[PDB]
């Protein structure tokens, strides 16, 4: 586990030095040009399981200093959508901008970036015993990308998440979360999504991820977004440590190269 940052000396263009996979040709994130997407006519329809159930109070949130992570304590499954088997949810991470809903997503569609991108990571439990096992076996995991877009009104479905962020302002803080409905953190219409093969968007940047990217965004008000802009981290140099806003925590987009993006 090498040190890495989103900017400066250990920023994205330096990642390859300590994690050579970060210089790969199947990296994530990407811009999705819809008119170049192939229509996946062979897809079995996306099936979600457990997404409608209230999350347990053992579910918790952490400020890792690079993102805010949610460690899921319930069984959630996704299958179909050209995914190789049935995948189980492990955790959630977020990426956001700077202020006033400025671009913060990792992916984009037709060049449009979004104020927040939420990512849910999955493993196939039929092949591996845990998410950690799947990572260390270095073969294949699943990931969902969800965009948020500014809305004039608060999205009440987000309340436990926003309240969570209020409670993890500093690097390494942790809090338990009020119950939430994971389905309600997904777009209202799951109809349009994209599929492509890619990688982790942080070191070690392993090219093992089957990505689902939903086209339609989830609403979030400017008032709720402020909870994201109120997250801090620390930056530690040779002889200074400082408390800083955690902002623009996204990786630059990567070339498609030989890859084609598919769409529902």
């Amino acid at each position: 586990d090498p040190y890495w940052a989103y900017s400066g000396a250990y920023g994205p263009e330096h990642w390859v030095t300590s994690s050579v996979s970060c210089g790969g040709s199947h990296q994530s994130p990407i811009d999705i040009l819809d008119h170049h997407a192939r229509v996946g006519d062979e897809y079995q329809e996306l099936q979600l399981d457990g997404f409608d159930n209230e999350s347990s109070n053992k579910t918790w949130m952490k400020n890792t200093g690079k993102t805010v992570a949610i460690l899921l304590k319930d069984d959630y499954f996704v299958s179909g959508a050209g995914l190789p088997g049935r995948f189980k949810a492990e955790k959630v991470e977020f990426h956001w901008g700077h202020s006033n809903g400025s671009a913060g997503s990792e992916h984009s569609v037709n060049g449009r970036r979004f104020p927040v991108e939420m990512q849910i990571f999955f493993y196939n439990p039929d092949d591996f015993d845990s998410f950690q096992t799947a990572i260390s076996e270095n073969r294949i995991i699943g990931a969902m990308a969800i965009f948020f877009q500014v809305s004039p009104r608060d999205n009440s479905a987000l309340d436990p998440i926003i309240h969570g962020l209020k409670g993890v302002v500093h690097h390494e803080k942790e809090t338990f979360l009020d119950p939430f409905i994971l389905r309600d953190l997904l777009p209202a219409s799951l109809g349009s999504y994209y599929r492509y093969t890619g990688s982790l968007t942080t070191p070690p940047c392993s090219e093992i991820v089957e990505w689902i990217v939903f086209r339609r965004p989830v609403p979030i008000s400017y008032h709720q977004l402020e909870a994201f802009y109120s997250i801090f981290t620390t930056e530690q140099q040779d002889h200074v440590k400082s408390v800083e806003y955690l902002r623009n925590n996204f990786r630059p987009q990567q070339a498609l190269n030989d890859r084609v993006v598919s769409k529902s």
């Binding site: 140099q237 040779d238 200074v240 440590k241 400082s242 408390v243």
Partner: peptide, 16 residues
């Protein structure tokens, strides 16, 4: 000589 420390008024800083 050490690198100049640049910080914001109001910002918390530790010099090592």
């Amino acid at each position: 000589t050490r690198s100049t420390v640049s910080v914001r008024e109001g910002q918390g800083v530790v010099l090592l």
